[PDB]
Write a protein that holds these residues in place. Structure first.
Motif, PDB file in Angstrom:
ATOM      1  N   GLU A   1       4.536  -5.971   8.325  1.00 39.96           N
ATOM      2  CA  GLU A   1       4.813  -7.399   8.400  1.00 39.96           C
ATOM      3  C   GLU A   1       3.717  -8.108   9.182  1.00 39.96           C
ATOM      4  N   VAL A   2       3.109  -9.121   8.558  1.00 41.19           N
ATOM      5  CA  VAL A   2       2.171  -9.979   9.273  1.00 41.19           C
ATOM      6  C   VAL A   2       2.943 -10.975  10.134  1.00 41.19           C
TER       7      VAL A   2
ATOM      8  N   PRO B   1       0.814  -1.216   0.000  1.00 43.77           N
ATOM      9  CA  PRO B   1       0.000   0.000   0.000  1.00 43.77           C
ATOM     10  C   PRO B   1       0.847   1.265   0.000  1.00 43.77           C
ATOM     11  N   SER B   2       0.260   2.323  -0.565  1.00 47.32           N
ATOM     12  CA  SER B   2       0.897   3.635  -0.559  1.00 47.32           C
ATOM     13  C   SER B   2       1.036   4.186   0.851  1.00 47.32           C
ATOM     14  N   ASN B   3      -0.004   4.049   1.665  1.00 46.63           N
ATOM     15  CA  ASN B   3       0.042   4.392   3.075  1.00 46.63           C
ATOM     16  C   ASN B   3      -0.058   3.114   3.891  1.00 46.63           C
TER      17      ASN B   3
ATOM     18  N   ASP C   1      -8.121   4.383   2.954  1.00 48.75           N
ATOM     19  CA  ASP C   1      -6.741   4.342   2.494  1.00 48.75           C
ATOM     20  C   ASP C   1      -6.555   3.524   1.231  1.00 48.75           C
ATOM     21  N   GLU C   2      -7.079   2.300   1.192  1.00 51.47           N
ATOM     22  CA  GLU C   2      -6.990   1.444   0.011  1.00 51.47           C
ATOM     23  C   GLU C   2      -8.398   0.941  -0.275  1.00 51.47           C
TER      24      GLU C   2
ATOM     25  N   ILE D   1      -9.722  -9.722   6.759  1.00 50.64           N
ATOM     26  CA  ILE D   1     -10.017  -8.754   7.808  1.00 50.64           C
ATOM     27  C   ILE D   1      -9.374  -9.253   9.093  1.00 50.64           C
TER      28      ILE D   1
ATOM     29  N   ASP E   1      -1.278   2.393   6.751  1.00 43.71           N
ATOM     30  CA  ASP E   1      -2.323   2.345   7.763  1.00 43.71           C
ATOM     31  C   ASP E   1      -3.171   1.084   7.677  1.00 43.71           C
ATOM     32  N   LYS E   2      -2.971   0.265   6.649  1.00 42.38           N
ATOM     33  CA  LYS E   2      -3.619  -1.034   6.551  1.00 42.38           C
ATOM     34  C   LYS E   2      -2.757  -1.936   5.682  1.00 42.38           C
TER      35      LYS E   2
ATOM     36  N   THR F   1     -11.554  -7.580  15.508  1.00 38.38           N
ATOM     37  CA  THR F   1     -11.521  -6.138  15.323  1.00 38.38           C
ATOM     38  C   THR F   1     -12.645  -5.712  14.390  1.00 38.38           C
TER      39      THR F   1
ATOM     40  N   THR G   1       7.872  -0.259   6.077  1.00 37.36           N
ATOM     41  CA  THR G   1       7.232  -1.497   5.669  1.00 37.36           C
ATOM     42  C   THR G   1       6.344  -2.038   6.791  1.00 37.36           C
TER      43      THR G   1
ATOM     44  N   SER H   1     -15.337  -2.716   9.269  1.00 42.54           N
ATOM     45  CA  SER H   1     -14.820  -1.359   9.137  1.00 42.54           C
ATOM     46  C   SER H   1     -13.582  -1.314   8.253  1.00 42.54           C
ATOM     47  N   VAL H   2     -13.312  -0.131   7.701  1.00 44.51           N
ATOM     48  CA  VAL H   2     -12.151   0.105   6.852  1.00 44.51           C
ATOM     49  C   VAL H   2     -11.822   1.593   6.923  1.00 44.51           C
TER      50      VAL H   2
ATOM     51  N   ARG I   1     -12.148  -4.990  11.371  1.00 44.40           N
ATOM     52  CA  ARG I   1     -11.545  -3.876  10.659  1.00 44.40           C
ATOM     53  C   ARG I   1     -10.493  -4.419   9.703  1.00 44.40           C
ATOM     54  N   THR I   2      -9.894  -3.515   8.933  1.00 42.70           N
ATOM     55  CA  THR I   2      -8.930  -3.891   7.909  1.00 42.70           C
ATOM     56  C   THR I   2      -7.485  -3.595   8.287  1.00 42.70           C
TER      57      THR I   2
END
Lengths: 243, 165, 165, 165
Positions: free
Chosen positions: B149-150, B45-47, D19-20, B74, B49-50, B78, B147, D15-16, B80-81
């Motif tokens: 990392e999962v 991703p460019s940012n 960003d992407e 997901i 945040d996810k 949470t 970067t 939720s998201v 969320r993403t």
């Protein structure tokens, strides 16, 4: 839990269970990987150890097996293995509706008589194979004592499972050799009961034979012509008595 | 039969940083399909945040088949993403390197300039000349993003996109 | 039949540094295929965060066949994509060379400039003229990154991508 | 049969952040369609005063059907298309970074120029040189907008666009 259902539902109404389930989800997600490998290595180790122990016991008590299993007594005058007979009592069949077929007893020829060179022994029936594995490889090593403990107990359960499988195989082989011995002795007893024809075998003897390069002084060709079988005429059946 | 857009849970056991693309696997352990494992890849991703996992190639045991549901991720517990990792990886090192190169350049030039109004001269010398090359090289390498990392011990939640047989 | 995206193991025993591409061999140690050997290659990452192995050409003993199931590597007992090696191979060498060349040039020029306000003059001479050529040559050679290198005694994990027979 | 542009309701659960782009799911919990669900995506506006959901792929449970009524979302109990989120995410961070970099540049240059009319000179040094590079980097990074983020536990209303069966 769900056994105390209303209490569990009112507890789940609080968000403390919601913050508590997020770690047990990761625990059950990481849980299942170690168990299969521990079970596999336990199965191999327990199976090999139990097989080695039981073959050691068999080698210890080999003598009375030779005492009880006299196949050499069972052969006949032309070195022919007796055929195998099976019996059954009080047969019935509800094959479908409007149909019942019953019968008193049944007898079945299992394996036909044939020529033999040496009598079979119990070692062809009861000796278990033994290849000891000495190559332990670990997929994921235990880091926590909890995962080390569950790895240990799953290895122990695999050891127990390999023990059970060895016992099962031994028991099936025991049943197999007992079936063959019972079939032979039942053939002898039924021949005494005068229900089965004896085998009939002819001989053809020839003297010197061959070309100018090969000679055979006396050759005998032995050939069985009449296989044993059961009879249908009931009158030739001598019964028994006792005192 | 899979509904167009339902939810499942899968076991993810292997980790990867957002630096090199490659195939990655998860394992669905509940629901209708059991023992199934799913390979795919990730995205950059460019940012930061996810971070999500592109999952497209499913294998269900029992039969020799490879169906083609493309499925996304997901974060469990949470809904969320976002990715549970660090995002402050490579800010402060290049920040401090740039600031130190600058401070060296400034030390040499200003304490060379304030001479009219040997060891201090050699200090001026060293900072005056090693500031500039480190400054241009730090502006060269300053552009590296942070970067993600999962992790190798957390599963995931999977929302579906298409239907399969 | 090997399912689409399952797990296997191999052992790496012959080491290489990540400089020139070539064939590299591993041996599959467990599972269905026993005694099997796999030759493949590697890739060069521009960033020093991980290093991975491109394994493509598989050989199974017993039957003289060569299938080409392609698979990659993960780090054992971390379940990550990184290589266990050093990433600080060539930082401080070029750093010290460039900074020494700079400080030499600065010494000669500033102690030349401090003359208005024989041995120290010869110091000015040597520093002032050996700074510049080493400065431009260090800026020339400053571009070579730190290499990574696999070991000759580490196992590896192999995750499948396609099915074979 | 659904009239051309009526109002339905659903419950949004995933939720998201903005960003992407990605697939998002909601479940229609009222009306004739019970247990039906809808996946789609969102939009990234020039100004973050609202957020809408591009919802196109509709699934009816039980039967393997996928209709294509494409519709949008509005905020509950405002009868508007805005999102309940925060919009002041990334103003003050870049504001403070830019202002500090500027103030550093100014301190070095003006307290350098005020020398005519050692530690204070070192303050001049540090601010004089770390102002400029951080200033141009702050002008580089000043452009990142303030994003929005939807929530994982709020419902939604869906106004129709076309008719279906």
């Amino acid at each position: 839990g769900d056994t105390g259902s209303l209490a569990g539902l009112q507890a789940m109404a609080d968000s403390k269970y919601t913050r508590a389930q997020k770690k047990q989800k990761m625990g059950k997600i990481r849980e299942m990987a170690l168990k299969e490998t521990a079970l596999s290595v336990g199965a191999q180790a327990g199976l090999a150890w139990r097989a080695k122990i039981i073959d050691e016991q068999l080698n210890k008590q080999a003598r009375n097996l030779d005492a009880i299993y006299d196949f050499n007594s069972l052969v006949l005058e032309h070195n022919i293995l007796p055929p195998v007979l099976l019996e059954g009592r009080n047969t019935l069949n509800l094959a479908d509706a409007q149909s019942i077929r019953i019968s008193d007893r049944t007898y079945k020829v299992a394996k036909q008589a044939h020529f033999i060179t040496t009598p079979p022994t119990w070692r062809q029936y009861l000796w278990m194979d033994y290849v000891k594995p000495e190559a332990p490889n670990v997929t994921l090593l235990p880091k926590t004592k909890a995962e080390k403990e569950i790895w240990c107990i799953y290895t122990e359960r695999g050891w127990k499972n390999g023990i059970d499988q060895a016992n099962t195989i031994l028991e099936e082989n025991i049943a197999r050799i007992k079936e063959d011995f019972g079939g032979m002795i039942l053939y002898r007893k039924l021949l005494a009961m005068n229900m089965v024809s004896p085998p009939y075998v002819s001989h053809t003897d020839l003297g010197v034979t061959g070309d100018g390069s090969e000679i055979h002084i006396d050759d005998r060709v032995l050939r069985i012509t009449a296989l044993p079988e059961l009879n249908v005429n009931s009158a030739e059946w001598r019964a028994a008595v006792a005192k | 039969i899979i509904k167009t857009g339902d939810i499942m849970f899968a076991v993810l056991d292997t980790s990867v940083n957002s630096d090199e693309p490659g195939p990655i696997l998860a394992t669905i352990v509940t629901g209708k399909l059991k023992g199934s494992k799913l390979i795919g890849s990730f995205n950059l991703p460019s940012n930061a945040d996810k971070m999500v996992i592109t999952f497209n190639t499913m294998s269900i045991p029992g039969a020799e088949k490879t169906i083609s549901i493309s499925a996304y991720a997901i974060d469990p517990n949470t809904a969320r993403t976002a990715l549970a990792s660090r995002t402050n990886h490579h800010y402060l090192m290049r920040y401090g390197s740039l600031f130190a190169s600058s401070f060296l350049q400034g030390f040499g030039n200003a304490f060379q300039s304030a001479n009219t109004t040997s060891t201090l001269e050699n200090a001026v010398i060293g900072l005056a000349t090693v500031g500039k090359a480190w400054s241009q090289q730090a502006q060269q390498l300053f552009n590296t993003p942070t970067t993600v990392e999962v992790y190798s011990g957390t599963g995931l939640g999977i929302l579906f996109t298409q239907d399969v047989t």
